[PDB]
Amino acid sequence: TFPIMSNFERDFVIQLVPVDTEDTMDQVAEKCAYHSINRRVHPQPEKILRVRRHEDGTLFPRGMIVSDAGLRPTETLDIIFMD
């Protein structure tokens, strides 16, 4: 349990998303879309969801776990479309 802020690509607003310290970057990206995809942003299944620290641009591989990114509670992240 670890709260984060979610700047979802092509959405209008950063949102509060509870995630787990063990969730993988992939699994973060899923918990986020629940709140953006098909609410406000159209699904893109030629494309893969990535998870990148908002402050500085840095980027996370899909299978990396929260506990290992050393985020600050309530740290904002981008949930971007890639391939």
């Binding site: 709260p3 802020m5 700047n7 690509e9 092509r10 959405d11 209008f12 607003v13 950063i14 949102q15 509060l16 998303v17 629940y34 709140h35 098909n38 609410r39 406000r40 942003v41 159209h42 908002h54 402050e55 600050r72 509670p73 309530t74 740290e75 904002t76």
Partner: protein, 491 residues
């Protein structure tokens, strides 16, 4: 025979003396007056452009009130309110909640200048400033009170600022910073100059005009009269700014204005923006919230600032740009999160509405249009639940408003984060952050609603919990202003 006013006016405000039995600083504590090292004798140069005396006041404001109260009496029974555009009714319920008690609280703001300010013209003008806001608060209660039987939502004219509902907090965030927790000279700048002279007076005009166009004259007259009072105490900032520049203080003054205007802009971008461009029927829209702002607020600020010896705030180019985006953000948020507010948000994304929107804001449909596409699809397709939320958005830690900006094909939503003494704050503009930085001690341990959620201050810690904590129940909780009318246009 009576004297000409010109003949004796000065004696009303000839009221400083040298204290003997208490010291100057005991009498005028620096935390309350913010005399700022400038001599009593140099404050005495304060000269308000628009002068009034007591009998003239009680005489004019009698007829002012006679009139408005008679309009209200006359139209009362016709009950216009039950056949008004519901985009309208909403505008009213929003306004009353946000303004009534804040107006009332302005009198204390003025009562601040009227006891604590070193310039005596200011002290007397501030007394009618006090007298002014007492009306506003009182009148803005009597009026919505006719409608308490119609919807519980009208109770919020009184109850709003007593709650922890996200807007109420946004409002207190603005006003308490601006007018309640600052010294005399500061209030005169931040409130009367920046907010009343800069924003309110023009808004109140706009709002009366719009009230009229919508066929609501009781309201048309109410706003219209409150505006007649603005000029008389709104003036009070100018002469202070004058005095400050003319000594060692253009920076301190400059800074306060910079702050005052941004914060003003932000509150404004969520209470007025959305109404102008969404709640008001299409055939009643004279001009865009963008145009309006450019014509009726921007030039006027530059005008004022040139005349005073000041320069445009650092953020000005940015501000210009933001007129294209910020409010549709705030609109989208308000509507999406419509059960968290006490009025019923008009969607305002019918086809025609959408072209109009694309006329005034080119490249709207390829940004804001996108989200609304998904929303509409969902309502066409019988899945509405995906148009209400399951989470809070991130709240700017200054303006106490969601962090929201351009989506779609030109996506540009940013969070201006700051770590400060352990805590990580979140900011919705370059400016919101910077406001904090120059005054960290002033905001340090305040907590927006999201922080409260997170610190376990909101219990149960789910959505229903936050609903209760913001004193919102079914019946005041907001829904689509038109009961999803504009949907049929898409099937």
């Amino acid at each position: 025979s009576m004297l000409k006013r010109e003949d004796w006016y000065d004696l009303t405000r000839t009221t400083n003396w040298t204290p003997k039995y208490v010291t100057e600083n005991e009498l005028f504590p620096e935390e309350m007056s913010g005399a700022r090292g400038i001599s009593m004798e140099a404050w005495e140069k304060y000269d308000e452009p628009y002068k009034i005396t007591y009998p003239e006041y009680v005489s004019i404001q009698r007829e002012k009130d006679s009139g408005a109260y008679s309009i209200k009496a006359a139209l009362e029974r016709d009950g216009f309110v039950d056949r008004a555009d519901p985009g309208w009714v909403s505008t009213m319920q929003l306004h009353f909640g946000a303004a009534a008690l804040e107006e009332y609280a302005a009198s204390t703001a003025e009562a601040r200048m009227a006891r604590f300010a070193k310039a005596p013209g200011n002290r007397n003008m501030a007394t009618f400033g006090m007298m002014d806001e007492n009306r506003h608060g009182q009148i803005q209660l009597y009026f919505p009170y006719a409608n308490v039987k119609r919807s519980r939502k009208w109770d919020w004219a009184h109850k709003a600022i007593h709650t922890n509902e996200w807007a109420a907090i946004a409002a207190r965030s603005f006003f308490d910073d601006m007018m309640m927790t600052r010294d005399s000279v500061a209030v005169s700048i931040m409130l009367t100059f920046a907010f009343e002279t800069g924003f309110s007076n023009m808004q109140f005009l706009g709002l009366a005009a719009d009230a009229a166009e919508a066929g609501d004259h009781t309201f048309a007259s109410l706003i219209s009269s409150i505006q007649t009072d603005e000029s008389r105490h709104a003036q009070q900032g100018g002469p202070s700014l004058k005095i400050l520049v003319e000594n060692g203080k253009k920076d301190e003054a400059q800074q306060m204005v910079d702050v005052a205007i941004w914060r003003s802009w932000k509150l404004f971008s969520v209470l007025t923006g959305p109404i102008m461009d969404y709640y008001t029927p299409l055939e009643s829209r004279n001009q865009s919230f963008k145009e309006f702002m450019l014509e009726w607020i921007v030039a006027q600020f530059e005008r004022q600032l040139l005349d005073l010896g000041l320069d445009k705030p650092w953020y000005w180019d940015q501000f210009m740009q933001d007129l294209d985006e910020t409010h549709h953000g705030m609109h989208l948020g308000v509507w999406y999160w419509r059960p968290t507010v006490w009025w019923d948000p008009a969607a305002g994304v019918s086809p025609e509405e959408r072209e109009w929107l694309e006329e005034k804001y080119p490249g709207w449909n390829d940004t804001w249009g996108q989200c609304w596409d998904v929303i509409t699809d969902n309502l066409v397709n019988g899945k509405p639940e995906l148009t209400v939320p399951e989470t809070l958005p991130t709240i700017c830690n200054m303006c106490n408003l969601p962090i929201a900006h351009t989506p779609g094909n030109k996506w540009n939503v940013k969070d201006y984060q700051l770590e400060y003494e352990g805590r990580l704050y979140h900011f919705g503009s370059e400016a919101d952050r910077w406001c904090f930085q120059i005054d960290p001690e002033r905001y340090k341990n305040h907590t927006n609603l999201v922080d409260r959620f997170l610190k376990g201050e909101i219990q149960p810690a789910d959505l229903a919990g936050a609903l209760m904590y913001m004193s919102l129940e079914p019946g005041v909780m907001g829904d689509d202003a038109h009961d999803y009318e504009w949907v049929k246009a898409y099937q």
